[PDB]
Amino acid sequence: YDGRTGEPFEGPIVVGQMFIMKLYHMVEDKMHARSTGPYSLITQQPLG
Amino acid sequence: QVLYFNKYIVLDPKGAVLDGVPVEKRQLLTDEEYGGIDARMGAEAIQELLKELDLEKLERELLEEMKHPSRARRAKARKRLEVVRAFLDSGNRPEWMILEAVPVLPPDLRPMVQVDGGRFATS
Numbered sequence: 177y178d179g180r181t182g183e184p185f186e187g188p189i190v191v192g193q194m195f196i197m198k199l200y201h202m203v204e205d206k207m208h209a210r211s212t213g214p215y216s217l218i219t220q221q222p223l224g
Numbered sequence: 225q226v227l228y229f230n231k232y233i234v235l236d237p238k239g240a241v242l243d244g245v246p247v248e249k250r251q252l253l254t255d256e257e258y259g260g261i262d263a264r265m266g267a268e269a270i271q272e273l274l275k276e277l278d279l280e281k282l283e284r285e286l287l288e289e290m291k292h293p294s295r296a297r298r299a300k301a302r303k304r305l306e307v308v309r310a311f312l313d314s315g316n317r318p319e320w321m322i323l324e325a326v327p328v329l330p331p332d333l334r335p336m337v338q339v340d341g342g343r344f345a346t347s
Contacts, residue, residue, distance in 0.1 A: 217335070217337055218335060
C-alpha cells in the first residue's frame with residue numbers, strides 16, 4: 177500500500193529483511209563552501 | 225668547458241700567432257702549454273670575444289661554404305646562420321650573453337615566511 181494514496185501498488189512487490197551497513201564516508205566530513213577567507217601568503221591565494 | 229673552469233687559456237686577440245707551431249686565429253692553448261696569454265681566461269674571454277666579431281661577414285663566410293661543400297660537416301655550416309641571422313635581423317646583440325649584471329628577483333616572490341615561531345622557510 178502506498179501510504180500516501182490508499183490504493184496499493186498494482187503488482188506484487190518483493191519485500192523482506194535486508195542486512196545493510198553504514199560506511200566510512202558520511203557527507204558530514206565532506207561538504208564545504210567558501211565565499212572568501214584564508215588567503216595563502218606563499219603562492220598568494222586561498223588555502224588552509 | 226675548459227674556457228673558464230679547469231683553467232685552459234683562451235687565445236683572444238691579437239698578436240701575431242705561432243709559438244712552436246702557427247696557431248690559426250682561434251684557440252686555446254694549454255695551461256702549462258706555455259706561450260703566455262694576451263688573451264686571458266674566464267668569460268671576459270668569450271665576452272670581448274663576441275663583441276669583436278663581424279656580424280654580417282659570417283653571412284658571407286657561411287654563404288660561400290653553403291654551395292661548394294662536402295655535405296658531412298658542411299651541414300652544421302648552415303646551422304651557424306640559424307643563430308647568426310637569428311641575432312641579426314632581430315635587434316638583439318650577443319656579448320650580453322656573458323653577464324655584466326646578475327639581477328635579483330623581488331622578495332614578495334621568493335618569500336621569507338615565518339613557520340611555527342622563529343624558524344623560517346626561505347623560497
